[PDB]
Amino acid sequence: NKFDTQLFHTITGGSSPENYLFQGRQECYAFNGTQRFLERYIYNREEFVRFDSDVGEFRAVTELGRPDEEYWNSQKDILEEERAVPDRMCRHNYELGGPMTLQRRVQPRVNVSPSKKGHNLLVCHVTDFYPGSIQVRWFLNGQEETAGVVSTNLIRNGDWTFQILVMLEMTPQQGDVYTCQVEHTSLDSPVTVEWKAQ
Amino acid sequence: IKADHVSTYAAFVQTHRPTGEFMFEFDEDEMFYVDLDKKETVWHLEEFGQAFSFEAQGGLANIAILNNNLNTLIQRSNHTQATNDPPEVTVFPKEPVELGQPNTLICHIDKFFPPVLNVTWLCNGELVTEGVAESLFLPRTDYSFHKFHYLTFVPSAEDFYDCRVEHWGLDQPLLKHWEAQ
């Protein structure tokens, strides 16, 4: 129940005020029950070399990558370690982390408010849910509404919770009921909250 | 790339300011990091800490390794410094604002490079010294960065706030207004 780790490579060559920056990425992708590995080596914002496991060996992204792709691709003992990752570290950590991640389901909270002053909007604010995937829908006297509907992008709170806002432009006639409905995996059943337009 | 989920170790190393970061994220959310002074792993949510662990050295090692790579690319790059990419900033609350009722203001600082950055909150124009927290420097797909600062507060009509930001890509320090709309 310890997380798994790869070491980045140590290139040969170690053989506004000034600032230099080196970045690395070791990314695991998980498409329907599978595992793809990318190892990336970046100098100030510039990816210059990368190991993609689909590809199977090093690919210089930039001419700064040549001294690396050429050296390392004659070095098979290293090239195999990168080849084994998708089914060691990637798969280890994926299923290890699962029950608090993939299985992590935190329920949305829902609030509905006007916005007539300052058109005529209604605001469905949905807060404090995980994961990002969600669906927010608007209903007028039972009928779904596509028109006049603006949903924000999905907002990331930075603390493992998202929020989203979906507004609807409207013009209440008389006995009108507007309903906002939310579909999210954390919920056995979609949640609704209403505005009576008496 | 077309995946269901993305789990990535992201680390950086630079001459300035915050000299190194080692972290890991799940679908963009930092799950843990290695504190390079305390030499310990910090878990983002404590409930994480009670189930999983990570051997901290694995982080200090990768840092040392990235400095070698830094040196090696200062040399071969001919000493190329990157242009200063300026932050874009938004400020929004954590919950639907309710007067007199405890809440959290978020300031999202986005799309910048490099991760050398000063941030402070101001309440009615005065520096705020407590009720304040901050995210690590977070990695981005296009190799720029983002970050979050937080302020716990009691929403009120009589009060305004600004996220105040400082970065080499800005001429002037940048302020974002927010107030109980």
- HSE, CB side, 13 Å, CA atoms: give it for residue A38: 20
Please, is A40 exposed, middle or buried when counting C-beta atoms within 10 Å of its C-beta (0-12, 13-18, 19+)?
buried
B44 Cβ under 8 Å from any chain A Cβ: yes
Instruction: Report chain B's C-alpha Rg in angstroms.
Output: 18
In the three-class reduction of DSSP (H, G, I as helix; E, B as strand; rest coil), residue B87 is classed as coil
Name the residue facing B106 among A21, A27, A158 (closest C-beta): A158
Resolution in A: 2.6
CATH entry 3.10.320.10 includes domain A1-102: yes
The residue among B46, B81, B116 that closes a domain is B81
Technique employed here was: X-ray
Residue with tokens 């070399």: A49
Say yes or no: A6 contacts chain B, CB-CB below 8 A: yes
Question: Based on the domain organization, do B90 and B76 belong to the same domain?
Answer: no
Shared domain check, B66 and B94 = no
Residue ranges per domain, chain A?
1-102, 103-198
Residue A119 · residue A169 · CB < 8 Å? yes
Half-sphere exposure of B113 (CA within 13 A, CB side): 21
Q: How would you write chain A as a 3-class SS string?
A: CECCCCCCCCCCCCCCCCCCEEEEEEEEECCCCCCEEEEEEEECCEEEEEEECCCCCEEECCCCCHHHHHHHCCCHHHHHHHHHHHHCHHHHHHHHHHHHCCCCCECCEEEEEEECCCCCEEEEEEEEEECCCCEEEEEECCEECCCCEEECCCEECCCCCEEEEEEEECCCCCCEEEEEEEECCCCCCCEEEEEEEC
- On whether both B43 and B19 belong to a single domain, the answer is yes
CB contact at 8 A, A154 and A114:
no
B47, B81, B115 - which closes a domain = B81
Same domain? For B30 and B98 the reply is no
Residue type, B80: T
Judge if B110 and B57 occupy the same domain.
no
- Contact list in B for residue A107 (CB cut-off 8 A) is none
Residues 6+ apart with CB under 8 A from A146: none
Question: Same domain for B94 and B154?
Answer: yes
- Does B102 lie in the same domain as B138? yes
Residue span of the structural domain in which B52 resides:
1-81
What 3-state class would DSSP assign to B1? coil
Which among B15, B47, B81 is the end of a domain?
Answer: B81
Nearest-angstrom CA–CA distance, B53 and B115: 27
Whether B68 sits inside 8 A of A45 (CB atoms) is: no
Q: Strand B20-26 vs strand B6-14: parallel, antiparallel, or unpaired?
A: antiparallel
CA distance to partner chain A, nearest, from residue B3 (Å): 4
Q: Is the Cβ–Cβ distance between B62 and B11 less than 8 Å? A: yes
From first CA to last CA, the distance across chain B in angstroms is 39
CA-based nearest residue in chain A for residue B29: A160
Nearest to A10 among B6, B65, B92 (CB): B65
Q: How many domains does chain B have?
A: 2
Residues B118 and B150 in one domain: yes
Yes or no, beta carbons of B114 and A44 under 8 Å apart: yes
CB-CB neighbors (< 8 A) of A23 in chain B: 10-13, 139, 143
Residues B117 and B134: beta-carbon distance below 8 Å? no
Q: Give B31: exposed, middle or buried? Use CB within 10 Å, 0-12, 13-18, 19+.
A: buried
Half-sphere exposure of A51 (CA within 13 A, CB side): 25
Q: What's the CATH number for A103-198?
A: 2.60.40.10
Is residue B58 located within the same domain as residue B97? no
Q: Are residues B50 and B88 in the same domain?
A: no
Q: Is A70 on the interface with B (CB under 8 A)?
A: no
- Token pair 């662990």 is found at B53
State the virtual CA torsion across A160, A89, A94, A41 in degrees, nearest 10: 40
CATH number of the domain enclosing B48: 3.10.320.10
Check: CB of residue B54 under 8 Å from CB of residue A3. Answer: yes
Q: Are A52 and A86 in contact (CB under 8 A)?
A: no
CATH number at residue B95: 2.60.40.10
Give, as one character, the DSSP assignment of residue B152.
E
Which residues 146-185 on chain A approach chain B with CB closer than 8 angstroms? 155-160, 163
> At B52, is the secondary structure helix, strand, or coil?
coil
Q: For residue A15, give the chain B residue with the closest CA.
A: B72
* A65: closest CA of chain B, how far (Å): 11
- Reference A66, options A45, A53, A48, A44; nearest CA is A48
Of A21, A25, A127, the CB nearest to B114: A21
Q: Are residues B54 and B69 in the same domain?
A: yes
Nearest to B54 among A2, A102, A159 (CB): A2
Q: Chain A within 8 Å of B43 (Cβ-Cβ)? A: no
Residue among B9, B81, B144 whose CB faces A26 most closely: B9
Give yes or no: residues B90 and B175 share one domain: yes
Q: Is B78 on the interface with A (CB under 8 A)?
A: no
